Amino acid sequence: VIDSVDASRVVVRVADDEVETGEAGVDIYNLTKYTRSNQNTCINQRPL
Amino acid sequence: NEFLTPRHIDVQVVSQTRAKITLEPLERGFGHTLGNALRRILLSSMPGCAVVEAEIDGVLHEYSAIEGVQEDVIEILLNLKGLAIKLHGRDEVTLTLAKKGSGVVTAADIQLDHDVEIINGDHVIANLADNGALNMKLKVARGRGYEPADARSIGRLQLDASFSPVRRVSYVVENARVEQRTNLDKLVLDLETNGTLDPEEAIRRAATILQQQLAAF
């Protein structure tokens, strides 16, 4: 279940069944903001 | 010869947009030379209101995002270009917006003013969260057509404003009868706007533009 959604990062709460160890588990995905590409173009990610 | 001067204004308002009007029974042949002329005047130049500059007290440039919000600053500024703002007795006002908490920021959260009226109140601007909040100032002005920011301290974010309330104009020519002549036609304009200006006031404004371009002829 997704915990909190930000324009710069997305943190999800791992389900109780898909955990390798014996803890809760939290996955954090940092979104790439406006960066330069090899062809001088824009690259950024937007949450869905 | 003899001509029947159209002096009547029949407006059928079904909603805030798509107002069907019917001027009067025109003369034979004046359904197309007057209907297509009025269409090229409404879709060309009609005064409107648009946000020309937005200043946020937390962000420097429109590319960097702010924490606590979901939409990017570019997406927030792009949502401001869809506001239907109506100014009554001013040419340039300065609005403000400040909301905290996990609430969907809409167009109704802007501080109320006496000379400012917002038609769309369900227009979503940005989505907040418990992480942070936003606060910005809006500056609208009066214009006539499309004017980009290039042809118009570091926190000033200029926007490309389009001062045009009309969206789609169509006209049909039917038959009319006033028990005086046999061949008389009427003109029906299917004017559709964003609800800013009055459809009955747009015809009198368009008739003045055509009359001013012919008085000097």
Swiss-Prot record, chain A:
It comes from the Bacteria. Belongs to the RNA polymerase beta chain family. The RNAP catalytic core consists of 2 alpha, 1 beta, 1 beta' and 1 omega subunit. When a sigma factor is associated with the core the holoenzyme is formed, which can initiate transcription. DNA-dependent RNA polymerase catalyzes the transcription of DNA into RNA using the four ribonucleoside triphosphates as substrates. This is DNA-directed RNA polymerase subunit beta. It comes from Pseudomonas aeruginosa (strain ATCC 15692 / DSM 22644 / CIP 104116 / JCM 14847 / LMG 12228 / 1C / PRS 101 / PAO1).
Curated annotation (Swiss-Prot), chain B:
Keywords: DNA-directed RNA polymerase, Nucleotidyltransferase, Transcription, Transferase. It catalyses: RNA(n) + a ribonucleoside 5'-triphosphate = RNA(n+1) + diphosphate. This is DNA-directed RNA polymerase subunit alpha. GO terms for biological process: DNA-templated transcription. DNA-dependent RNA polymerase catalyzes the transcription of DNA into RNA using the four ribonucleoside triphosphates as substrates. The N-terminal domain is essential for RNAP assembly and basal transcription, whereas the C-terminal domain is involved in interaction with transcriptional regulators and with upstream promoter elements. It comes from the Bacteria. Its EC number is 2.7.7.6. Homodimer. The RNAP catalytic core consists of 2 alpha, 1 beta, 1 beta' and 1 omega subunit. When a sigma factor is associated with the core the holoenzyme is formed, which can initiate transcription. Belongs to the RNA polymerase alpha chain family. It is an enzyme of class 2 (transferase). Residues 1-217 are annotated as: Alpha N-terminal domain (alpha-NTD). GO terms for molecular function: DNA binding; DNA-directed RNA polymerase activity; protein dimerization activity. GO terms for cellular component: cytoplasm; DNA-directed RNA polymerase complex.
